[PDB]
């Protein structure tokens, strides 16, 4: 599921386009996972061993990220493509 099905589900999702005119295109290209990480009240990342999550009533979960390519077309023969990585 993790290595194939999440990525292939994201690929199978259609691109998103919006009209106000400013035309838009949203694309999801690659998926990224870190190890199970934990943020305290201060928002500081740290590795989370499963005993800590079992003890502290947390959830033994990892963050998920996808690179998002937003290509905006202002109908002036231009396609401003901006990629936001590890979102």
């Amino acid at each position: 599921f993790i290595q194939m099905s999440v990525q292939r589900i994201v690929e199978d999702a259609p691109p998103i386009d919006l009209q106000a005119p400013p035309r838009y295109l949203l694309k999801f290209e690659q998926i990224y996972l870190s190890k199970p990480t934990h943020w305290e009240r201060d928002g500081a990342p740290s590795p989370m061993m499963p005993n800590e999550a079992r003890l502290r009533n947390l959830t033994y979960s990892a963050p998920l990220y996808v690179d998002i390519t937003k290509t905006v077309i202002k109908e002036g023969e231009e396609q401003l493509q901006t990629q936001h990585q590890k979102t």
Partner: peptide
């Protein structure tokens, strides 16, 4: 396939 990231590549955006 889904890529793996090390904990050092996780920017501190979750706190901001």
């Amino acid at each position: 396939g889904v890529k793996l990231l090390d904990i050092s590549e996780l920017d501190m955006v979750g706190a901001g």
